[PDB]
Design brief:
The structure is a homodimer. By secondary structure, chain A is mostly beta strands. The first copy, chain A, contains 2 helices and 12 strands. Helices cover 4% and strands 55% of the residues of chain A. In chain A, strands 1-2-3-12-11-8-9-10-4-5-6 form an 11-stranded mixed β-barrel. Chain A: Keywords: Chromophore, Luminescence, Metal-binding, Photoprotein.
Chain lengths: 222, 220
Amino acid sequence: LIKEDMRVKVHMEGNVNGHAFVIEGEGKGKPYEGTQTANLTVKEGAPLPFSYDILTTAVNRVFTKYPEDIPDYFKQSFPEGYSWERTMTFEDKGICTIRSDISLEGDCFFQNVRFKGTNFPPNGPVMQKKTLKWEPSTEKLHVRDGLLVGNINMALLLEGGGHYLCDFKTTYKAKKVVQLPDAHFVDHRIEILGNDSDYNKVKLYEHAVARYSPLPSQVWHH
Amino acid sequence: LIKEDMRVKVHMEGNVNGHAFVIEGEGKGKPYEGTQTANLTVKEGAPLPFSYDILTTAVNRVFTKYPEDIPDYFKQSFPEGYSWERTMTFEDKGICTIRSDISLEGDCFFQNVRFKGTNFPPNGPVMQKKTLKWEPSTEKLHVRDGLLVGNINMALLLEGGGHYLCDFKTTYKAKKVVQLPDAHFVDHRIEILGNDSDYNKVKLYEHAVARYSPLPSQVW
């Protein structure tokens, strides 16, 4: 069903500090390898007056390397697929709320995303476009009320040095009954590989790998 | 100054939901391997009417394995040492604030700890003692305001299933100028190895290893 090589289609409709935008993307990835690349084009709202980086994580946990001893919530969901809802809570009170529907037609995932950012300060790094990138991250995942929940301490590296912090909560919800995993981790690294001056054109990449703690337990448990 | 085998001495003055208590500990560890074990004794305030697990992470990042290419903020700090302050913010409005001073006498670290906990629901997992253990964790650390800060999405496994969440923020402050690391991670596993039913006597272990991302950057 989910092949070694798969395609990606992204539509994103958004609004940040009252600024409306539409982004379209096409990409490819290796689902079992947890890697993918996408090419993003701004259809509306150009030139974006805010940091592109707030958008990149909204552009699919199907692209995560899962070891055999951890049930794969996301690959198991197909062909029905899944959706997710995320809150991005920034340390200066900027907040983003995102919802995405992940469907599959043929070899291509369609990712229909709704993005809203509000309350970013005019002098802050988002509106002044002072971010360089996201640090790589570790997402902690558990089951809460029957759904899969991920939490992350994210940090955007800033021009002139230093970090601008963001707390990520995502709730992932399969559209069919999938086998649920114990608490685990996903290591991430998201990166813009290339862009034009205005970020109207962007080449984006993510690598993600699921795992347990690498440290052995000292106490036997069932 | 830091040998491959080192000693620990713990003194904790505590108060949780108005319950006063004192804990003394003695332990040993391998600073370069990231492992240590401690034997803790409730000196005053026995028996504790809350879950022991809230206390355990309060009971020294000098016991973390740091690779060559990440500056070791904690190990550098000695002989002068370091202190830390942490906020534990639970999903049910329970809150802990903790301060710790870490000094070194001979081969023995002395960890002088003040623990304050408030606003735990009287029918919640902490006051009702329904936690099983902490999950293992990954702490993210970056420099802020000239000091080292770590954040963690922590979780306690519950009797009867599921997790009870707690967000950790820690600020670590060295008592001399040390070379500061770039943003990195510390993976942890804390475990109670053994206890008497009251938790008057607890054997406690932690393992921690510092690292960068295992994923290679695509840009130079």
